[PDB]
């Protein structure tokens, strides 16, 4: 229905989608400066279950994994969460080159890839109704820096051979998605929207820090995918990202000291 070209990319989707013009939208960029640390907010930590895993995908906006959230397998608790949230999959975005592909941004630096992982409150009974919540949604966020190759990554880019073409899927198991997380496990936090359509406002986002390194070759694997179905041309899935949306006056927090600012 919608997509990243120029006819019907982020600046057009207000038009078919009305929430694309909110007030909470994501992603933002993110000034240092203008983030205050907040000294109550409290660690979060993950339970997830690698054989929760079930299918990887190709709906030709993006690659996704699919966990089974049917019942509390794999869970999010801590940070400014009310309460644990069942993780339901986690897909990425990146760009044509490795200058840039990050959605959101921290001091004007862009990152080749943004990793989202989705969770829900199960306080709301059903995802659906989850996303009429302000707090429905749980995301957590990870940049990819270019650097040393990630081992378990690799796992997750070998299986893209299963889905090169859009609308394909494929089983995907016994993969533990908190194997892809950083040392350290400071964070961001601000309230949002999905950065693709409908573009609820019902996301409590979680950026990390420190970014998880990946090697060029990697994100070429990645960039191998293509947009388009099965029985058409070539069409390379790249630049899958939406570019900042209006902070407005939203409060970022920061879970972390930043020492270099002042005395
Ligand atoms: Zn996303």
Same mark, same amino acid.
């Given at each position: 229905?919608?997509? !990243?070209?120029?006819?019907?990319?982020?600046?057009?989707?207000? *038009?078919?989608?009305?929430?694309?013009?909110? *007030?909470?939208?994501?992603?933002?960029?993110? &000034?240092?400066?203008? %983030?205050?640390?907040?000294?109550?907010?409290?660690?979060?930590?993950?339970? !997830?279950?690698?054989?929760?895993?079930?299918?990887?995908?190709?709906?030709?906006?993006? =690659?996704?994994?699919?966990?089974?959230?049917?019942?509390?397998?794999?869970?999010? /608790? +801590?940070?400014?969460?009310? +309460?644990?949230?069942?993780?339901?999959?986690?897909?990425?975005?990146?760009?044509?080159?490795?200058?840039?592909?990050?959605?959101?941004?921290?001091?004007?630096?862009?990152? $080749?890839?943004?990793?989202?992982?989705? &969770?829900?409150?199960?306080? !709301?009974?059903?995802?659906?109704?989850?996303?009429?919540?302000? #707090? +429905?949604?749980?995301?957590? +966020?990870?940049?990819?820096?270019?650097?040393? *190759?990630?081992?378990?990554?690799?796992?997750?880019?070998? $299986?893209?051979?299963? %889905?090169?073409?859009?609308?394909? *899927?494929?089983?995907?198991?016994?993969? #533990?998605?908190?194997?892809?997380?950083?040392?350290?496990?400071? !964070?961001?936090?601000?309230?949002?929207?999905?950065?693709?359509?409908?573009?609820?406002? =019902?996301?409590?986002? @979680?950026?990390?820090?420190?970014?998880?390194?990946?090697?060029?070759?990697?994100?070429?694997?990645?960039?191998?995918?293509?947009?388009?179905?099965?029985?058409?041309?070539?069409?390379? @899935?790249?630049?899958?990202?939406?570019?900042?949306?209006?902070?407005?006056? /939203?409060?970022?927090?920061?879970?972390?000291? &930043?020492?270099? &600012?002042?005395?």
């Amino acid at each position: 229905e919608w997509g !990243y070209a120029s006819h019907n990319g982020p600046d057009h989707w207000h *038009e078919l989608f009305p929430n694309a013009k909110g *007030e909470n939208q994501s992603p933002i960029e993110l &000034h240092t400066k203008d %983030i205050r640390h907040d000294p109550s907010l409290q660690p979060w930590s993950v339970s !997830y279950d690698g054989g929760s895993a079930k299918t990887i995908l190709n709906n030709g906006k993006t =690659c996704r994994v699919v966990f089974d959230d049917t019942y509390d397998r794999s869970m999010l /608790r +801590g940070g400014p969460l009310p +309460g644990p949230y069942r993780l339901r999959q986690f897909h990425l975005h990146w760009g044509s080159s490795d200058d840039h592909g990050s959605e959101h941004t921290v001091d004007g630096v862009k990152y $080749a890839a943004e990793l989202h992982l989705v &969770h829900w409150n199960p306080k !709301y009974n059903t995802f659906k109704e989850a996303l009429k919540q302000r #707090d +429905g949604i749980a995301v957590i +966020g990870i940049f990819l820096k270019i650097g040393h *190759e990630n081992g378990e990554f690799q796992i997750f880019l070998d $299986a893209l051979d299963k %889905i090169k073409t859009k609308g394909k *899927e494929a089983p995907f198991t016994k993969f #533990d998605p908190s194997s892809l997380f950083p040392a350290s496990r400071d !964070y961001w936090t601000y309230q949002g929207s999905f950065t693709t359509p409908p573009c609820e406002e =019902c996301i409590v986002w @979680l950026l990390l820090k420190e970014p998880m390194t990946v090697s060029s070759d990697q994100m070429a694997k990645l960039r191998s995918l293509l947009s388009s179905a099965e029985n058409e041309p070539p069409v390379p @899935l790249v630049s899958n990202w939406r570019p900042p949306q209006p902070i407005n006056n /939203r409060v970022v927090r920061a879970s972390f000291k &930043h020492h270099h &600012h002042h005395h």
